[PDB]
């Protein structure tokens, strides 16, 4: 957004996250043995899913794969959900030990309310496309139209590229997996459990397919990544 400051020829080239295939190219590129068993291509699609296409953390990841085995690679894949990015924090071509020190700053610069919105988007399902009303439940605000959730969730995606806007089929945002496990081991352990419950309230009223408005009352489809959140908040 620093560009609204200018009045000029402003042209943009956006660096998106590395596609599932480029990650392959990148691995082959720095000496990585490619899978054979099915549960080896899966080890690597897990890493690629977790570090939601991210050059820097992918890099700490290879650099931290010590024996080079697919095995110790899935070890790191374990190490990643249950100790956060700190399981793979390393000396890297990046000036920073782990991706959390970088996103750090990005969160500090943030509008105070956006700091809030962000702090709560923990209590979501990661790598899942989900509607504005499903966000109006955990996200704060100072009536009957909650688009304000959307202005905030947009500023949040423009400014460190933390969310992810996707216009149709229906107006939905998304938190990636790296941009989430940052928030896991970083927000106040309480505000997680407050979001799970403050969610389970609105949670009742009267695959490549979005969750229909006939089936929102049950977020239980995503029970797994919530059981992981309640098990977390109770340690």
């Amino acid at each position: 957004e620093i560009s609204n400051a200018a009045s000029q020829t402003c042209e943009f080239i956006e660096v998106t996250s590395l596609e599932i295939d480029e990650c392959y190219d990148f691995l082959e590129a720095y000496g990585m043995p490619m899978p054979v068993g099915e549960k080896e291509e899966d080890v690597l699609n897990k890493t690629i899913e977790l570090s939601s296409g991210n050059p820097a953390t992918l890099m700490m990841f290879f650099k931290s794969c010590e024996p080079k085995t697919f095995e110790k690679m899935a070890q790191l894949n374990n190490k990643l959900e249950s100790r956060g990015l700190v399981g793979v924090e390393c000396i890297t071509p990046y000036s920073y030990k782990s991706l959390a020190m970088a996103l750090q700053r990005c969160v500090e610069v943030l509008s105070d309310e956006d700091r809030s919105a962000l702090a709560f988007a923990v209590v979501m399902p990661p790598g899942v496309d989900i509607p504005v009303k499903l966000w109006s439940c955990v996200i704060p605000v100072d009536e009957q139209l909650d688009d304000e959730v959307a202005d905030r969730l947009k500023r949040l995606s423009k400014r460190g590229a933390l969310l992810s806007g996707k216009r149709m089929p229906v107006l939905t945002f998304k938190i990636d997996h790296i941009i989430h496990m940052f928030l896991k081991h970083v927000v106040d352990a309480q505000t997680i459990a407050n979001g799970i419950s403050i969610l389970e309230q609105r949670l009742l009223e009267i695959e490549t397919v979005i969750r229909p408005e006939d089936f929102p009352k049950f977020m239980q489809l995503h029970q797994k990544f919530y059981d992981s959140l309640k098990n977390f908040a109770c340690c």
Binding site: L103, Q104, V186, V187, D188
Partner: peptide, 6 residues
């Protein structure tokens, strides 16, 4: 609320 901003 935010473990020292991260």
């Amino acid at each position: 609320m935010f473990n020292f901003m991260g």
